[PDB]
Structure formats: C-alpha cells, structure tokens
Amino acid sequence: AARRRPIRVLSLFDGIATGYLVLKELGIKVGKYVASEVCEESIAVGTVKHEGNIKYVNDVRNITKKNIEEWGPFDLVIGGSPCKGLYEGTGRLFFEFYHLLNYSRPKEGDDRPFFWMFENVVAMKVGDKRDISRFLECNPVMIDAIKVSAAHRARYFWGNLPGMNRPVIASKNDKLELQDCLEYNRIAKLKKVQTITTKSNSIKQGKNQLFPVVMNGKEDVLWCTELERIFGFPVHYTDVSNMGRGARQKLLGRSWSVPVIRHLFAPLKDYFACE
Amino acid sequence: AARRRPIRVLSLFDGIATGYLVLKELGIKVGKYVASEVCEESIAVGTVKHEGNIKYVNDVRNITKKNIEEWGPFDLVIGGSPCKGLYEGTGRLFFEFYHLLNYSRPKEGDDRPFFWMFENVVAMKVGDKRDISRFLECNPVMIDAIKVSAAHRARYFWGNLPGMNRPVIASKNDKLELQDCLEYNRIAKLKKVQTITQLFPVVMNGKEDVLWCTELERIFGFPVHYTDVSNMGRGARQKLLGRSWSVPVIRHLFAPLKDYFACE
Amino acid sequence: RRRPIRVLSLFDGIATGYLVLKELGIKVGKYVASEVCEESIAVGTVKHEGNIKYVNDVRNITKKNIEEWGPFDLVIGGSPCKGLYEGTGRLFFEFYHLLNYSRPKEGDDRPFFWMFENVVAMKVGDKRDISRFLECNPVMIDAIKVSAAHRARYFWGNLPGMNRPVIASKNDKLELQDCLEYNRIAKLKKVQTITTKSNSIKQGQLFPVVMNGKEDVLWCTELERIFGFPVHYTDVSNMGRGARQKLLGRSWSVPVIRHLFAPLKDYFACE
Amino acid sequence: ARRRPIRVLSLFDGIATGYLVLKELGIKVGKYVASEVCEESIAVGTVKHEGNIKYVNDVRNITKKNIEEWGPFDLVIGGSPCRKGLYEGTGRLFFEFYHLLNYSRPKEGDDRPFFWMFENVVAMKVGDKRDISRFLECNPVMIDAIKVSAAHRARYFWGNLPGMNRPVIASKNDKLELQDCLEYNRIAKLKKVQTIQLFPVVMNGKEDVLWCTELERIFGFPVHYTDVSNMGRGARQKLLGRSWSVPVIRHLFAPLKDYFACE
Ligand SMILES: Nc1ncnc2c1ncn2[C@@H]1O[C@H](CSCC[C@H](N)C(=O)O)[C@@H](O)[C@H]1O
Ligand SMILES: Nc1ncnc2c1ncn2[C@@H]1O[C@H](CSCC[C@H](N)C(=O)O)[C@@H](O)[C@H]1O
Ligand SMILES: Nc1ncnc2c1ncn2[C@@H]1O[C@H](CSCC[C@H](N)C(=O)O)[C@@H](O)[C@H]1O
Ligand SMILES: Nc1ncnc2c1ncn2[C@@H]1O[C@H](CSCC[C@H](N)C(=O)O)[C@@H](O)[C@H]1O
C-alpha cells in the first residue's frame, strides 16, 4: 500500500455482498462500495455483516448518469446477472449493466486504471453468449467452482481483471470435498454435489433424488450452515433477520462461489491500498 | 480541408438506395457504397437505377468484423430501422447496426472524418427511444418531411452529421403540395398527404381515385418511374416507397458533407 | 397549304397511332378513338394529355356520328387478335362500314388514307374474304426486321408505299440486349411472338434473360422497348404485370407503324 | 329509244322466276346467267325455257374473271336461301352475292343503267336486317304477295329498281283467291293460304291438301311448270316453297320495259 488509494467499487446485482466480503478478506482497503440490490433479505446480510459500510442504492433501472458521475469515480464495476434469455425480462437487465459500465469508464484522456467484470450462468443460448461478447468486446472464460470447492458451479466471466483467463488452482484452505463442509457426525455419501439452484430440488443427486448426507443411518438434506461452507462464505454469514431454510438457500443458491471471486480479485492488491 | 477524396459509405437496411441517390444528386463523389438488404425487389431497384455502383451483401445478421475490415474503411455508416418493440423481433436488428457501427468506427485517436446516422419512426415506445439514446450516446433530432415534401413523415434521426438541428427550409424544386405531384387531368382534394404504410385524395373525371405509383414517387421526392423494376405492381411499389425515407429530408441531412468529401 | 391530319382510329388500344404521328412530327388536329378497355383508355388519356377524343364500343358508332366528327383523312383499325364471321372477328365489318361512311363523297378529290391490321395466323378463306371486301391484297410485315421480336401481321390499306420492303433505322433496337436493363444478359437475340398470356416469354420453355446466373422473364420496361414504345409508357393507373403485358401483347410494333405513316408527312401539316 | 335486250345475272336462281317474269313482261332477254346447284331446280329452267338460261355452278366458285367474261350485266338479282342467321351457314352466301354484285357494277362514273335486287324473308333477325342494309347502303321495301296472289308471302326487297315503293295493285288476270287455283270438284275452305292444323281443300265432302298443280297457281306460276324430272309431291313443293311469287316480281320488274327492248 504505497502511493495507492483505497478501492472505489460499484457492484450491481450485489446480492449478499460477496464482492465486499472478498475485497476485505484479501485486505484491500475499501473506500466506497455502491450496491444496487432489491432483495430486502439480501440487503440485510450486507448491512449487518459489513456494518453499514456498503452504500446501498436501489433498483438498477433508476440509476442515471448523473448518479454515476456523483457517486463516482469508480475503480471497479462488477455485476452478476440474475440466474426467457437475454432480450426478455430479467435477462435484459444486462443492458442496464452495460450503460452504467460505460458511464463509469474513464473519459478520453484519463489513463487511470479501471477494472470490471460481468458473470452469467453457463446455461445460456449460444446466440446470447455470442451477443454479450459482442457488446462487451470480450470473450468469457468458464470458471467452475468444482476446482476450488465441493460444488459444480459453471459460470461465464467477462471482464478485464488481471489474470482472469489464468487457469484455476485450489488453495490449502479451500474445503475441497463435501466431507470438509459438513458438521459433526455427518457422513457425505458423495464428494462433489451437483449444481445448486434456489429450489430444494438441487440438494438431491440428479438421477434418483437421493440425499447427500447420512447421519445416524438415515439420509438427510444439507443444513444451511453446510451450504455456507460449500460456497466459501463464512459460517453463519446468512443467520440474519430471522431467515429459515427458505431464504438462506435462495440467497446462497443465487450467489457467487467465494473462492472463485477471490481468484479474480487477488491481483487487485497490486493496484490499490491494502491493510 | 482541400485535399478531399470520394466517400466510402456502408448503408444498412438500404431499401431502394435512398442514400446513394441523394449523394449523387448532391454532387458528391462516391468511391464505394456497400448495402445490406434482403428484399430482392428492393435490391433490384438500386442495382438497375445505379448501374451496379452499389455493392450488395446480404442479411445484416451475417456481417462479421472481418467483412468490415475488408470492405472498409468507411466514412459514413447509415441505417434505417424496420418499423413488438425494440427487444423483440425486427426491432432487435438495431443492435446489429450498433455493433457494425462500432466495428466501423475509426481507430481511437484517428482524426479522419467519420459520420453516422440512424433513423426510426416516431411511432415508437418512449422506453425504446430512450434505450436507443443510451446505446448511441446521442439524442434524436426529429425531422418531418411536411416542410419539404407533400407527405407526413415524422422520423427520429440519431447521428453526428454536421448541423442536424439546423432549421429545415424548402428548395425551389421541392414539390410541396399534392397537386404538384399529380398526373394529367387529376386534381388533389388535399394539399399534404397523411402517412403511407377514409376519403380518397385524387379526383379524376369526377370519380374519386387513389394515388398512382408514379405519384407516390413524386411525393417522397424520388425520380418518377424509379420503382418500375422487376415486374413490381401496385403492391410492391407501395410497400417499398412506404418503408422508404423522404429524399429531401435526407438531402437536408447529407448536404453539409460536401464540405468534407469530394464533389463532381 | 396543307392542314393537320384528322384520323379515326378504331380498336385503338394504347394510342400507337397518335404516338407515331407525333413522333413523326405530323400536326394532329383531331384524333377520334374507339376503345373499350378502361386501362388502355387511361394510357392514351394521360400519355397524350387528353388530345385523343375517346368515344366507345365501335358497335354504337353511327353514320350520323361519322358525319359529325368528320371529315377524316386517315381511318385505321387493328382487329382483336373463332374466325371472321364469329365473335370478335366479325367486328371487322363494323370497321368496314365506318370506313365506307368516312370515305369522300363521289366527286371529292381530297386525299383519304386507311389501313387495317390483322394477325397472320388466319384461316386461308378469311384472308381471301377480307381482301374481297377491301378490294385490296395484304402485305405481310414482320417486326423482326425493325425490332427484337417476331411479329408477323397483315396490313390492308392504301397508304403511300405500304408494299415497300422494310428496312431498319439507325435508332431501332434490333437485338434483345439493346432492350434489356443493366446487368442482364439475353440468352437469345430475337424473341418469339408475344401475346397477352404470360407464356409468350418462355421460348418453346426457356427464360430469355439471365441475371446473377439466375434466369428471369422479361420486365415490363423491356417489353416497351421491344415494341418501340417509349419506356414507362404503360406505367399508368397502378397497372401491374397483368395489364402491361396484356396491353403490349395486343399492341402494334411502333417501328412498323412508323414505316407506314412516314410518307403521310407529304400530305398534311408537319411541325 | 335505241335500247337493247337485257343482260342479267341471277344468283340462287331456283326455278328461274326472273327469266319467266321477263318474257311474260314482254321484255327481250339477250342473256340470262344463273347460279344454282339443285339439279331438279336446274332442270325446270333448262326445259321450260329451251336452254336460253346459262347455268354455271355454286356461286362460291364464281370469280371476277368470270363476271368480266360473261358480262356485262344490266340486272343482278338474288334471293337468299331461307335459323343460324346471317354470319353462320347458309346466311353468309349473301356475301358471295355482295361481291359479285359490286364486281358487276359499271366503271365508277359510267352512265349506263344498272339495276339490282336482293330478296330475303321477313322471318329475319333485326340485327341481320340492319347489317344487310349497312352493306347494301339501302333500306328494304316489304311486299306481301297477299295483295296479288292467294298466299301470305311477305319478303324484303333490297335494290334500286324504279318505283319499288310503288303501291301494289292487282291485275285483271291475277288469281286472287284460293278457289280460283283449284282443280275440278274441289272447294276451298279458306280464301288465302298461309305461308308455305286444318286442311284447305274439300273434295267430295272429304278433306284434302293442295295438289302440286294448285300450288303452281298460288305462286302465280304456269300450270304444270314443275312437272319435270320425275319430281314427286315432295320435290315440287320444296322448289315452290322456296320460290318467289311471280306477280310480286312482275310488279318489281314492270318499270324495266322503259329501259330495255320489248317484243
Ligand atoms: N431489477 C433489479 N435491480 C437491482 N438488483 C436486482 C434486480 N433484479 C434482481 N436483482 C438482484 O440481483 C441479484 C442477482 S443474484 C447474484 C448476486 C451476487 N452474485 C451474489 O453473490 O449474491 C439478486 O440478489 C437480485 O435480488
Ligand atoms: N434482416 C435484414 N437484414 C438486412 N436488411 C433487412 C433485414 N430485414 C429487413 N431489411 C430491410 O431493411 C429495410 C428497412 S425499410 C428502410 C429502407 C430505407 N430507409 C429506404 O430509404 O428505402 C427494408 O427494405 C428491408 O428489406
Ligand atoms: N367491341 C369493341 N369496340 C371497340 N374496341 C374494342 C372492342 N372490342 C375490343 N376492342 C379493342 O380493340 C383492341 C384490339 S387490340 C389492338 C389495339 C392496337 N392495335 C394497339 O396498338 O394497341 C383492344 O384494345 C380492345 O380493347
Ligand atoms: N351454294 C349455292 N350456290 C348457288 N345456289 C345455291 C347455293 N346454295 C343454295 N342455292 C340455291 O338458292 C336457292 C334459294 S331459293 C330462291 C330461288 C328463287 N327465289 C325462286 O323463285 O326460285 C335454292 O334454289 C338453292 O338451290
């Protein structure tokens, strides 16, 4: 942290503040974090677990250039689309990411560094993936969390962060297999779970809808605290505002894999203040 | 400057080649004119009436960046949307124009002149009009042909052409009212025809009658018998002219390009 | 001391006669047409700015009318292309009677010219019969000598130098590639005879024109050139391919009618 | 004063009513050319007139070279064959009469007298009556034989003969009523026969049709004028049914005496 400043981030579709969490877990000094989220449950998680440092705004469709020019400047712009295709409904929110990203980019004649990233699910009509790549002038890299977690989570990542397209290597602290994410006296029938959506149908193996955990000879679904270890979140990250299996699995099912995002944000320690 | 060159233009959704027609009438040298059009009847009009000077390609969807670097460079990129909204069906062809326009833009910092234009009708959702303004980073200038032609054709013009908000004035040769565009022994009830896509406008021999194809051509400012090509009857001639630009509106927009490219 | 020509054209069609007299420079003082096609009437009414006095079905033209509209210096007619004494063929007799009513009274030296066209494809007895009525033998004139299309037609009449052999002019477009628009190659040099039905374009059934490697039928503006009509002569009253090919298929070859009317500059005013 | 015999071409001559009327009229006939194809009809005028009538053939085979050879002619006459109408079938044989008539007319400006006549039935389409008048440049005069014979025979007569509209008067020798035409012991129920369902004649209180000799007196022909070439009841009535009425023609031809030689 020499002659550099704290980072100034604009996270759209921020969810449960995965981005702010990683910048802190890396030790990057976070000067400003602007989140555009509508889920009042998701908003509760970042407001509490990060002690109101995140400046929450509102629906991304009501953000204007005048706002981007005032809240800014931004060093980082990140967005993860909501998991009808592109030009219909929720998918066409990407264009709201497109415009705010362009409004945030440095003006002609400002060589200052500017990084961005946009995640989207791998399950996507190839006409759409080809289209986003045309808008962003950039081709995605597929990063599967299986290499760094105990879950299949294939996602496409556009952007320009240093060493994105670098291949993924695990760390010694990553709970690599399901038995490492489980609580006491729980035996994982498998090693890697299938992809996890918001619905409970994603917790049982695809072929016969079989439970992945066996406690006391009887099969059981995963607990909420065990989902948090699978996605790399801190334990009890989502124990907020009286949420049950319903919400907790919704907020996590939509989320990023934290060890994946840390793989992308790790080189940002080079360009901004750290402590 | 003074050492100018002929103009290199890519025209998407070209139709009946109003852009090339307005250019040669303006007196500007055209070195290349690349057109993207899929209507064989429309293709035939610009192919015949301009002696193959127009390079046709195909469906704009099949144009890649390699094509733009082969056929380029370009000084002018012009496009007119096909009149469900923007994000569905034929409205979303605009994004194809959006990418090919950005592909064709000069290299960053290249001081060469480069101008573009995009047209769309006013009968458009305000949500789509704003979104196009957000994509192009530009606000439309509305120009109605009523001031220069005998037609109601209000349209939005996105672009960076010199002086687009310039006031629209008529020429000495602009056929302003309907009676100036009619064939022999025909009298016009009206003086400015409403839009073309329930009283008849023309009375001949005391019997009401619709306009003729040759009369539609004079209304939009096209040369007479401009659409008499490829056995097209009243049907095709009307839909081609119905979807087409008004010539004096375009000549108004393209006029200041003479001070940037060659002439004669 | 000559005066403008006064002509009565029966079965007038698209006013080929008026168009040719004009292109010759003969001053026309009165042109009385008998035509029923509302499309054809529109073509001569517009292209000649209403100088042609249209009347109607020839069967309602009476002697009292010929004496009112007259005198006539030229009386021309082309038959509708079942034989003579049946159907539309026997309209020739309506031409026969109006011609004789238009003739100068016994004791009038004034010049009087007439003409009657009919198709070569005709019963051998019907050709003898018309020639018996008109006291005149026909001369076969084929547009193929002056145009790019076979058009064999018989011409009864008494115009100066009809039976003269046909020779081409410097501006006649004799081969098909002279009548085509841009980027079109003619597989042929001379088209077979053209009729109203669309099958006249396919050569007994090859398309005559090739564009972009794909063969195509003739366009309308190319038919106008093949017959010698001015281009866009039939682009009138929202007519599509249906009417244009119908009117031109029945039409006269303009370079042929010019051949016959050219010596009439000697007998009437010209400017 | 210095007149000559009459040179006549009769088309569709039938049983030669023209040559009969001319000699009965007292007019000197120098040449009579007839176009007829019925061999029985041909036989009547050949025998009843001792070959003075020059028969040629079907009118359709008569060319202008013939009309110049056999001519000149002073009289051209023709009766139409009596329905498809004019422009179909036997109606259009009129046009063959048309051209041969105009072939025979004098050179344009020649003052010599030339007379023609065309006959057709009143049972005619008005459109064909109008067309024939347009061709001939002439309007027909209707003459019914009822005024001079004992029959209904109304026919149109196109032509240029002197006084064709002249009022029809009967002569002292015209057999006017049916009883005057009948053989012995036969009584006529009627006074005038309709054109050629009760019987007209009653012989010995029994009904009976007319005899061939009685038909010959009805049309004004000489008695036994058709007793030629083994002709039975059928043929004689056919020829007489299609014939002219002799007194009607004599009416038309009477004024020719003041133009040609009479003896
Ligand atoms: N119209 C809108 N404006 C702003 N945010 C929206 C939105 N519609 C959906 N969102 C939010 O976008 C988020 C996308 S899910 C992904 C969020 C992030 N990757 C995470 O780790 O949680 C959801 O939480 C949803 O609430
Ligand atoms: N998918 C596609 N690719 C290329 N061109 C298309 C297209 N779909 C429609 N078009 C063409 O785009 C035109 C839009 S109408 C506008 C034509 C033009 N403004 C003029 O002055 O004539 C239509 O003629 C249509 O044929
Ligand atoms: N009964 C009638 N009275 C008047 N004209 C008629 C008619 N019947 C047919 N016609 C016309 O006669 C024409 C014969 S076609 C010949 C027209 C002329 N030769 C030309 O160059 O166009 C047709 O146009 C037809 O409309
Ligand atoms: N093709 C033809 N050429 C010459 N004569 C013909 C003919 N066809 C029919 N005819 C004749 O025309 C005649 C019509 S009957 C009229 C004959 C006359 N009126 C009389 O007094 O007898 C018939 O005798 C018939 O034989």
The residue ranges of every structural domain in chain A are 7-161+254-270, 178-242
Structure token digits, residue B98: 């959006």
CATH architecture assigned to C176-234: Single Sheet (2.20)
CA–CA separation, B117 and B14 (whole Å):
12
Q: Where are the alpha helices (DSSP H) in chain A?
A: 18-26, 40-49, 65-71, 94-104, 126-136, 178-181, 224-230, 245-253, 258-265
Report the candidate in C71, C76, C43 with the shortest Cα–Cα distance to residue C58.
Answer: C76
Only one residue has tokens 């004009």, namely: C22
Strand pairing of C52-54 and C28-34? Answer: parallel
Provide the 3-class DSSP secondary structure of residue A127. helix
The experimental technique behind this entry is X-ray
Percent helix / strand / coil, chain C, rounded to 5 = 35, 20, 45
Do residue C238 and residue B48 have CB atoms under 8 angstroms apart? no
Q: What sign does the dihedral C96-C97-C98-C100 (CA atoms) show?
A: positive
Cα of C216 vs centre of ligand 2, distance in Å, is 24
In angstroms, the separation between the Cα of residue B106 and the nearest Cα of chain C is 34
φ and ψ at D132, to 5 degrees?
Answer: -60, -40
Do you find a cis peptide bond into B256, omega within 30 degrees of 0? no
Query: How many residues are present in chain B?
Result: 264
Pocket of ligand 3 (CB under 6 A): C 11, 13-14, 16, 34-37, 40, 57-59, 78, 80, 91, 250-252
Torsion region of A176: left, alpha or beta (phi above 0 gives left; psi -120 to 50 gives alpha): alpha
Provide the 3-class DSSP secondary structure of residue A135. helix
Active site residue D82: yes
Q: Is the minimum distance from the CB of D81 to ligand 4 under 6 angstroms? A: yes
Do residue C133 and residue D99 have CB atoms under 8 angstroms apart? yes
Cα of A162 vs centre of ligand 4, distance in Å, is 118
Do you find a cis peptide bond into D72, omega within 30 degrees of 0? yes
Write out the CATH class of domain B7-160+245-259: alpha beta
Do the Cβ atoms of D59 and D11 come closer than 8 Å? yes
The 3-state secondary structure of chain D reads CCCCCEEEEEECCCCCHHHHHHHHCCECEEEEEEECCCHHHHHHHHHCCCCCEEECCCHHHCCHHHHHHHCCCCEEEEECCCCCCCCCHHHHHHHHHHHHHHHHCCCCCCCCCCEEEEEEECCCCHHHHHHHHHHHCCCCEEEEHHHCCCECCEEEEEECCCCCCCCCCCCCCCCCCHHHHCCCCEEECCCCECCCCCCCEEECCEEECCCHHHHHHHCCCCCCCCCCCCCCHHHHHHHHHCCCCHHHHHHHHHHHHHCCCEC
CA–CA separation, B170 and B110 (whole Å):
36
CA–CA separation, B3 and B115 (whole Å):
18
CA–CA separation, D35 and A131 (whole Å):
98
C-alpha angle B63-B68-B73 in degrees, rounded to nearest 5: 155
Q: Which of C85, C93, C132 is closest, CB to CB, to D99?
A: C132
End-to-end CA distance of chain A: 7
Q: Where are the alpha helices (DSSP H) in chain B?
A: 18-26, 40-49, 65-71, 93-104, 126-136, 213-219, 234-243, 247-254
Do residue C221 and residue B229 have CB atoms under 8 angstroms apart? yes
Kindly identify the ligand whose nearest atom is closest to the C-alpha of A61: 1
Do the Cβ atoms of D122 and D155 come closer than 8 Å? yes
Provide the 3-class DSSP secondary structure of residue C15. coil
* Residues of C known to be catalytic: 81
Question: How far, rounded to the nearest angstrom, does the alpha carbon of residue C244 sit from its chain's CA centroid?
Answer: 15
Neighbours of A32 (CB within 10 A): 17
Burial C10-23 (b: 16+ CB within 10 A, else e): bbbbbbbbbbbbee
Structure token digits, residue B164: 């687009």
Cα of C92 vs centre of ligand 4, distance in Å, is 27
CA–CA separation, C5 and C207 (whole Å):
43
C-alpha to C-alpha distances, B193 to B78, B150, B220, D31, nearest whole angstrom = 27, 6, 10, 83
Provide the 3-class DSSP secondary structure of residue A11. strand
Pick the CATH number of B178-241 from 1.20.1080.10, 2.60.40.10, 3.40.390.10, 2.20.70.90: 2.20.70.90
Pick the CATH number of D178-239 from 3.40.190.10, 2.40.50.140, 3.30.565.10, 2.20.70.90: 2.20.70.90
CA–CA separation, A265 and C179 (whole Å):
72
From chain C residues 69-98, the ones with a CB under 8 A of any chain D CB are 85-86, 90, 93, 97
- Choose the catalytic residue: D82, D138, D212, D262: D82
CB neighbour class for B73 (10 Å; exposed up to 12, middle 13-18, buried from 19): middle
Helix (H) or strand (E) holding C4: none
CA–CA separation, D51 and D43 (whole Å):
10
Q: CA dihedral in degrees (B164, B169, B175, B177; nearest 10)?
A: 110
* Residues of B known to be catalytic: 83
CA–CA separation, C14 and C78 (whole Å):
12
Report the candidate in B107, B37, B108, B32 with the shortest Cα–Cα distance to residue B71.
Answer: B32
Do residue C236 and residue B185 have CB atoms under 8 angstroms apart? no
CA–CA separation, B119 and B79 (whole Å):
6
Report the candidate in C37, C34, C27, C30 with the shortest Cα–Cα distance to residue C4.
Answer: C27
> What CATH number should be reported for the domain whose range is A7-161+254-270?
3.40.50.150
D70 known ligand binder: no
Report the candidate in B180, B149, B161, B165 with the shortest Cα–Cα distance to residue B244.
Answer: B149
What does the DSSP 8-state code read for residue B35? E
CA–CA separation, A238 and A45 (whole Å):
6
CA–CA separation, D36 and D41 (whole Å):
8
Query: How many residues are present in chain A?
Result: 275
Structure token digits, residue D226: 């058709």
Amino acid at A251: L
Do residue B88 and residue A87 have CB atoms under 8 angstroms apart? yes
Report the candidate in A93, A104, A46, A87 with the shortest Cα–Cα distance to residue A233.
Answer: A46
What does the radius of gyration of chain D's CA atoms come to, in whole angstroms?
19
Do the Cβ atoms of D168 and D147 come closer than 8 Å? yes
Q: What would the DSSP string read from start to end of A74-118?
A: -SEEEEE-----SSSGGGGGHHHHHHHHHHHSPPTT-----EEEE
Q: Which of C86, C97, C100 is closest, CB to CB, to D87?
A: C86
Neighbors of chain A by Cβ distance (3+ pairs < 8 Å): B
Strand pairing of C209-211 and C185-186? Answer: antiparallel
Q: Long-range pairs for D64-69 at CB < 8 Å and ≥24 separation? A: D64/D103, D67/D9, D67/D100, D67/D103, D67/D104
CA–CA separation, B158 and B164 (whole Å):
9
Contacts for C214 with CB less than 8 Å, ≥ 6 apart: none
Structure token digits, residue A237: 């990250």
Strand pairing of C214-216 and C152-157? Answer: unpaired
> Under CATH, domain C5-159+250-266 is a member of which superfamily?
Vaccinia Virus protein VP39 (3.40.50.150)
Q: Is the minimum distance from the CB of D189 to ligand 4 under 6 angstroms? A: no
End-to-end CA distance of chain D: 14
Looking at beta carbons, which residues of chain D come within 8 Å of C123? none
Whether chain D has a CB inside 8 Å of the CB on C109: the answer is no
Amino acid at A143: I
Provide the 3-class DSSP secondary structure of residue C242. helix
Contacts for A34 with CB less than 8 Å, ≥ 6 apart: A9, A10, A11, A54, A55, A57, A71, A74
* Residue spans of beta strands (DSSP E) within chain C: 5-10, 28-34, 52-54, 74-78, 113-119, 139-142, 152-157, 185-186, 209-211, 214-216
Structure token digits, residue B228: 């008499």
From chain C residues 162-191, the ones with a CB under 8 A of any chain B CB are 181-183
φ and ψ at B158, to 5 degrees?
Answer: -85, 135
Whether chain B has a CB inside 8 Å of the CB on C215: the answer is no
Contacts for B228 with CB less than 8 Å, ≥ 6 apart: B213, B237, C220, C221, C232, C235
Chain breaks in chain A (C to N over 2.5 A) after: 83
Q: Which of C14, C31, C36 to mutate to test the pocket of ligand 3 (most atoms within 8 A of CB)?
A: C36
Do the Cβ atoms of D199 and D209 come closer than 8 Å? yes
Report the candidate in B132, B156, B134 with the shortest Cα–Cα distance to residue B144.
Answer: B156
Looking at beta carbons, which residues of chain B come within 8 Å of A99? 134-135
Resolution of the structure in the document, Å? 3.3
Neighbours of C163 (CB within 10 A): 11
C-alpha to C-alpha distances, D38 to C180, D42, D242, nearest whole angstrom = 64, 6, 12
Q: Is the minimum distance from the CB of D36 to ligand 4 under 6 angstroms? A: yes
Cα of B241 vs centre of ligand 2, distance in Å, is 12
φ and ψ at D203, to 5 degrees?
Answer: -110, 115
Kindly identify the ligand whose nearest atom is closest to the C-alpha of B16: 2
Do the Cβ atoms of C138 and C98 come closer than 8 Å? no
CA–CA separation, C48 and B109 (whole Å):
61
Do the Cβ atoms of A36 and A57 come closer than 8 Å? yes
CB neighbour class for D88 (10 Å; exposed up to 12, middle 13-18, buried from 19): exposed
**Probe site for chain C from D135, D136, D138 (most C CB atoms < 10 A):** D135
Q: Is the minimum distance from the CB of D6 to ligand 4 under 6 angstroms? A: no
Report the candidate in A275, A234, A173, A271 with the shortest Cα–Cα distance to residue A17.
Answer: A234
CA–CA separation, A155 and A18 (whole Å):
15
Neighbors of chain B by Cβ distance (3+ pairs < 8 Å): A, C
CB neighbour class for B18 (10 Å; exposed up to 12, middle 13-18, buried from 19): buried
Looking at beta carbons, which residues of chain A come within 8 Å of B87? 87-88, 92
> Which fold, D6-161+243-258?
Rossmann fold (3.40.50)
Do the Cβ atoms of D149 and D191 come closer than 8 Å? no
What does the DSSP 8-state code read for residue C146? T
Do the Cβ atoms of C235 and B213 come closer than 8 Å? yes
Kindly identify the ligand whose nearest atom is closest to the C-alpha of C18: 3
